[PDB]
């Protein structure tokens, strides 16, 4: 018994991945001493933990810049969308950036940007300088636009060398070939496929602007970073043993010959908190680096190719992927082939025509109960058994499950002469 | 507005954001003057010995204090930088796309550190069609 | 103060997933993970894995009985392979230690 | 010169992958102070560690 | 002591999460399909 689908639902699923934490740095002297000379001198005596902290955080910022620049800037030339868009009925206006908006972005990325929303100056006073990413949001959007243009015009070939213009239906037929479905299915149901794609895109657009919990990973990473910085700041409001939690009061009330012990307590406690914070930041940045490497690899063999690996480019068989920018992250619109509308069938591995088994050269053997047909694995396309679809492999005795049936020879009718 | 027994205001970490002076009853505020680090952008020492100092997250007001030679980037005020209209590839990243890249144009009105919005690469337009 | 919170997925439910994957892998082949489960005769699915490595389908069916003994004997070897030396489960024990 | 196999073999190789460690939790005051209210006051002085 | 223990856990938890993420890929490619990645789903040509 075998089951073969008869229809396909071309779903579009969104995978959201963190790409980069917010670039952050802190000054040891500003945080621990608060622009006080005595604490600065004591810490200079105490050691080079200042240099270690600043170097570690600078390395974090640099590697984050590298993540941002490497997950996106994979195109040698910044392609732009063609002016006239006869993309086989695929309404791409929702994801192709348009000049109508003051910011040259598309609609879905605009919804994503306005979905995630986060006082900072108060924390910024104690050396919590926040560096801006080298790549700006506009350039990220331009990278996404170039990637979309390459995928929509050249498909995968622009990853290898120079982009080669291809009619959109032709590259979609190639992708169906890559997923083991003959071109005839697409070139016969092109209008239905375009309608399904547009409906799925519209449903995705509506689903995005319904609940803000979709960008869960990005929201969680932003919240975690904000909470870490907030508790790092709040750590300044603890005595840690001494009389007061503020340096100026200790300096004013007590002479340094006596206040040195209390200020040493403050220095040790704040530096311990700071090194705990930088260790947490190191671990979180390693996690974000792993996520960004995964995102870059996913783009590399989903957007710029067609991976034959299950679930890497969306559940079900994979066709394309349309990257879209996001606040400190990326999202992929995995266009996935998914079969449906199954039907039970009776199958037989081989057919013995004249004492010789006739295995199918490409496809399975199925029967509607009355006739016997050969069809492709992933779509019910009944075909008459011919010698072109089969190949003889010796005597039909050793094979098990073989059924006695005829094989039509295409040459015989041509031999009417 | 402050209550009669309220004169010190701790913001989030025992930092007195607002204070009330004793003589009159005015309600004042506290904000640190010029917090913010610096940076140095230079080519190789063998290539050149002129540097450009970056004052991040600082509006271009304190440049004459430590010193055309004026630029206000999205990251901070940058000195010793000559803006250029065109755009090249990024040599020495600074921030917000402004990538300093020293270049000697013709040995005249050159031999200076310049800063510009970096180009994203060579623009292209594939000859797409339906057939 | 130290505590060991129990895992949400208890040992029984985990063994059901591995059973569910095994049930899907045997009858439905691989399409159960992508789309919907599709009944496949296990002879066909094996012949459709040989086709995925360049070996023509006819090789499997011409040698299906030989393959069945080859695989089953290997499974029996695995059973003896495990309960002979405990060092096979290296990484799992290292995590606990 | 080319070498082509004639009779194949089918093996079964086990693979070992950890999936999770022992979930663990801990409380400071029970661990650090041990239900003592004299230490419970001292610990909170060290901030939100 | 707790800081060292907590820091040890986080680094070790990264090891398992790296393996678990790798395990998911093995559970997806090797199990839910046939993978052509040589020496990823067992030595030699892979079947399932």
Between strands B98-100 and B114-117, the pairing is antiparallel
CB B75 within 8 A of CB B56: yes
Burial group, residue B9, by CB count within 10 angstroms (0-12, 13-18, 19+): middle
CB D45 within 8 A of CB A240: yes
CB A72 within 8 A of CB B117: no
Which has the closest alpha carbon to A320: A340, A289, A299?
A299
- Residue A18: which H helix or E strand, with range? strand A11-18
**Crossing angle (nearest 10°) for helices A216-234 and A256-300:** 170
Cα–Cα distance measured from residue D24 to residue A75, given in angstroms and rounded to the nearest whole number: 46
- Among D17, D28, D32, the residue with its CB nearest the CB of E26 is D17
Provide the β-strand partners of residue C89: none
CB-based contact, E9 to chain C, within 8 Å: no
User: Distance (Å) from the C-alpha of residue B28 to the closest C-alpha of chain A?
Assistant: 16
Instruction: Sort out which chain E residues have CB atoms less than 8 A from A286's CB and list them.
Output: 14
Give Cβ neighbours of residue C67 (< 8 Å, ≥ 6 apart).
C46, C60, D10
CB B116 within 8 A of CB B78: no
**For testing contact with chain E, the best of D10, D17, D20, D26 (most E CBs within 10 A):** D17
Cα–Cα distance measured from residue B10 to residue A227, given in angstroms and rounded to the nearest whole number: 20
CB-based contact, D8 to chain A, within 8 Å: no
Which has the closest alpha carbon to B95: A61, A42, A146, A72?
A61
CA A70, A73, A76: angle at the middle one, nearest 5?
130
Q: What's the distance, Cα to Cα, between the start and end of chain A in Å? A: 42
CB A345 within 8 A of CB A4: yes
Would you list the DSSP string of B82-126? Answer: EE-SS----SEEEETTEEE--B-SSSSS-SB-EEEEPP-SEEE--
3-state SS class at A214: helix
- Residue A268: which H helix or E strand, with range? helix A256-300
Q: Do E48 and C25 touch (CB under 8 A)?
A: yes
Cα–Cα distance measured from residue A222 to residue A216, given in angstroms and rounded to the nearest whole number: 10
Burial group, residue C38, by CB count within 10 angstroms (0-12, 13-18, 19+): buried
Count of C-beta atoms within a 10 Å radius of residue A61: 18
Q: Which of residues 17-46 of D touch A (CB under 8 A)?
A: 45-46
Which has the closest alpha carbon to A187: A212, A161, A169, A168?
A169
Q: Do B13 and A30 touch (CB under 8 A)?
A: no
3-state SS class at E29: helix
3-state SS class at A363: coil
Looking at residue C63, the DSSP 8-state letter turns out to be: T
Number of helices (H), then strands (E), in chain C = 6, 0
In this structure, the dihedral spanned by the alpha carbons of residues A246, A249, A252 and A253, taken in order and rounded to 10 degrees, is -120
Write phi, then psi, for A8 (nearest 5 degrees). -130, 135
Cα–Cα distance measured from residue C60 to residue C38, given in angstroms and rounded to the nearest whole number: 21
Cα–Cα distance measured from residue A68 to residue A291, given in angstroms and rounded to the nearest whole number: 12
Burial group, residue E43, by CB count within 10 angstroms (0-12, 13-18, 19+): exposed
Cα–Cα distance measured from residue C51 to residue A309, given in angstroms and rounded to the nearest whole number: 17
CA distances from C62 to A167, A349, C42, C66, D10 (A): 45, 11, 15, 9, 15
Count of C-beta atoms within a 10 Å radius of residue A241: 15
Write phi, then psi, for A262 (nearest 5 degrees). -65, -45
CA A97, A177, A299: angle at the middle one, nearest 5?
40
Burial group, residue B121, by CB count within 10 angstroms (0-12, 13-18, 19+): middle
Looking at residue A381, the DSSP 8-state letter turns out to be: -
Q: What is the largest CA-CA distance in chain C?
A: 65
As given in the structure block, the two tokens for residue E7 are 């820091």
CA distances from E7 to A28, A182, A284, A325, D30 (A): 22, 55, 12, 34, 20
Cα–Cα distance measured from residue A196 to residue A8, given in angstroms and rounded to the nearest whole number: 10
Closest chain D residue to the Cα of E26, Cα to Cα = D17
Residue whose tokens read 């929303």: A117
Closest chain E residue to the Cα of D27, Cα to Cα = E2
Cα–Cα distance measured from residue A105 to residue A146, given in angstroms and rounded to the nearest whole number: 12
Instruction: Sort out which chain C residues have CB atoms less than 8 A from A344's CB and list them.
Output: 39
Residue whose tokens read 């041509």: A414
Provide the β-strand partners of residue B83: B115
Give Cβ neighbours of residue A169 (< 8 Å, ≥ 6 apart).
A88, A186, A187, A190
3-state SS class at A178: helix
CB A124 within 8 A of CB A130: yes
Residue whose tokens read 């001493």: A33
- Among A80, A88, A233, the residue with its CB nearest the CB of B125 is A80
As given in the structure block, the two tokens for residue B4 are 């009669």
- Residue A3: which H helix or E strand, with range? strand A2-3
As given in the structure block, the two tokens for residue C22 are 């095994």
Chains E and B touch (3+ CB pairs under 8 A): no
Residue whose tokens read 């059924």: A403
Between strands B98-100 and B92-95, the pairing is antiparallel
Would you list the DSSP string of chain D? Answer: ------S-----------------B--HHHHTT-S-HHHHHHHHTT---
- Among D45, D46, D48, the residue with its CB nearest the CB of A231 is D48
Cα–Cα distance measured from residue A137 to residue A44, given in angstroms and rounded to the nearest whole number: 40
Write phi, then psi, for B115 (nearest 5 degrees). -130, 135
Count of C-beta atoms within a 10 Å radius of residue A118: 10
In this structure, the dihedral spanned by the alpha carbons of residues A258, A263, A264 and A268, taken in order and rounded to 10 degrees, is 160
**For testing contact with chain D, the best of E3, E4, E10, E20 (most D CBs within 10 A):** E20
Chains C and B touch (3+ CB pairs under 8 A): no
Chains D and B touch (3+ CB pairs under 8 A): no
Closest chain D residue to the Cα of C71, Cα to Cα = D10
Instruction: Sort out which chain C residues have CB atoms less than 8 A from D13's CB and list them.
Output: none
Report resolution in angstroms. 3.9
Q: Do C5 and D20 touch (CB under 8 A)?
A: no
Residue whose tokens read 């050149």: B48
Burial group, residue B23, by CB count within 10 angstroms (0-12, 13-18, 19+): exposed
As given in the structure block, the two tokens for residue A416 are 């009417």
Cα–Cα distance measured from residue A179 to residue A317, given in angstroms and rounded to the nearest whole number: 7
CB C67 within 8 A of CB C53: no
CA distances from A32 to A244, A267, C93 (A): 14, 6, 44
CB E34 within 8 A of CB C49: yes
CB-based contact, C14 to chain E, within 8 Å: no
Instruction: Sort out which chain C residues have CB atoms less than 8 A from E30's CB and list them.
Output: none
List b or e across B78-113, with b for residues whose CB sees 16 or more CB atoms inside 10 angstroms: bbbbeeeeeeeebeebbbbbbbbbbeeeeeeeeebb
Q: Do B128 and A125 touch (CB under 8 A)?
A: no
As given in the structure block, the two tokens for residue A10 are 């071309």
Closest chain C residue to the Cα of D28, Cα to Cα = C1
Instruction: Sort out which chain D residues have CB atoms less than 8 A from C97's CB and list them.
Output: none
CA distances from A236 to A229, A257, B37, D48, E43 (A): 12, 23, 21, 10, 56
Q: What's the distance, Cα to Cα, between the start and end of chain E in Å? A: 46
Beta strands in A248-384 (DSSP E): 317-326, 329-337, 339-340, 344-347, 351-352, 356-360, 364-367, 372-375
Cα–Cα distance measured from residue C34 to residue A179, given in angstroms and rounded to the nearest whole number: 12
Cα–Cα distance measured from residue E35 to residue B22, given in angstroms and rounded to the nearest whole number: 79
CA distances from E17 to A330, B129, C18, E40, E42 (A): 21, 47, 20, 18, 21
CB A365 within 8 A of CB A382: no
Cα–Cα distance measured from residue A294 to residue A18, given in angstroms and rounded to the nearest whole number: 10
Which has the closest alpha carbon to A75: A303, A306, A313?
A303
As given in the structure block, the two tokens for residue A286 are 């390693």
Instruction: Sort out which chain A residues have CB atoms less than 8 A from E35's CB and list them.
Output: 309
CB A368 within 8 A of CB A347: no
């Amino acid at each position: 018994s075998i089951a073969i689908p008869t229809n396909f639902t071309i779903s579009v699923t969104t995978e959201i991945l963190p790409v980069s934490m917010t670039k952050t740095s802190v000054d040891c002297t500003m945080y621990i001493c608060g622009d006080s000379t005595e604490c600065s001198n004591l810490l200079l005596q105490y050691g080079s933990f200042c240099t270690q902290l600043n170097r570690a955080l600078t390395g974090i910022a640099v590697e984050q810049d590298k993540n941002t620049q490497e997950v996106f800037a994979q195109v040698k030339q910044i392609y732009k969308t063609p002016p006239i868009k006869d993309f086989g009925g695929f309404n791409f206006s929702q994801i192709l950036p348009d000049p109508s908006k003051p910011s040259k972005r598309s609609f879905i990325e605009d919804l994503l940007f306005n979905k995630v929303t986060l006082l900072i100056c108060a924390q910024k006073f104690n050396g919590l300088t926040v560096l801006p990413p080298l790549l700006t949001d506009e350039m990220i959007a331009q990278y996404t636009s170039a990637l979309l243009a390459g995928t929509i015009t050249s498909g995968w070939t622009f990853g290898a060398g120079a982009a080669l213009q291809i009619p959109f239906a032709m590259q979609m037929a190639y992708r169906f070939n890559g997923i083991g479905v003959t071109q005839n299915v697409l070139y016969e149901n092109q209008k239905l496929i375009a309608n399904q794609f547009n409906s799925a895109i519209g449903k995705i657009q509506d689903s995005l602007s319904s609940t803000a919990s979709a960008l869960g990973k990005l929201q969680d990473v932003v919240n975690q970073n904000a909470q870490a910085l907030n508790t790092l700041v709040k750590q300044l409001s603890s005595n840690f043993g001494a009389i007061s939690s503020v340096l100026n009061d200790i300096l004013s009330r007590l002479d340094p010959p006596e206040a040195e012990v209390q200020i040493d307590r403050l220095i040790t406690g704040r530096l311990q908190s700071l090194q705990t914070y930088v260790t947490q930041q190191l671990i979180r940045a390693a996690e974000i680096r792993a996520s960004a490497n995964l995102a870059a690899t996913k783009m590399s063999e989903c957007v710029l190719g067609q991976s034959k690996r299950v679930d890497f480019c969306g559940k079900g068989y994979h066709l394309m992927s349309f990257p879209q920018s996001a606040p400190h992250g990326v999202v992929f619109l995995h266009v996935t082939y998914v079969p449906a509308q199954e039907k039970n069938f009776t199958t037989a591995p081989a057919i013995c025509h004249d004492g010789k088994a006739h295995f199918p050269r490409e496809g399975v053997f199925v029967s509607n109960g009355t006739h016997w047909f050969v069809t492709q694995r992933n779509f019910y396309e009944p075909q008459i058994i011919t010698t072109d679809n089969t190949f003889v492999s010796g005597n039909c005795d050793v094979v098990i499950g073989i059924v006695n049936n005829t094989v039509y020879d295409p040459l015989q009718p041509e031999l009417d002469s | 507005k402050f209550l009669p027994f309220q004169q010190f205001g701790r913001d989030i970490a025992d930092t007195t954001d607002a204070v009330r002076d004793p003589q009159t009853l005015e309600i004042l505020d506290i904000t640190p003057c010029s917090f913010g680090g610096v940076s140095v952008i230079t080519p190789g020492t063998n290539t050149s010995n002129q540097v450009a100092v970056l004052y991040q997250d600082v509006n271009c007001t304190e440049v004459p204090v430590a010193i055309s030679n004026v630029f206000q980037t999205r990251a901070g005020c940058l000195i010793g930088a000559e803006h250029v209209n065109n755009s090249y590839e990024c040599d020495i990243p600074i921030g917000a796309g402004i990538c300093a890249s020293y270049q000697t144009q013709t040995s005249v009105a050159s031999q200076s550190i310049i800063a510009y919005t970096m180009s994203l690469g060579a623009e292209n337009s594939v000859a797409y069609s339906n057939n």
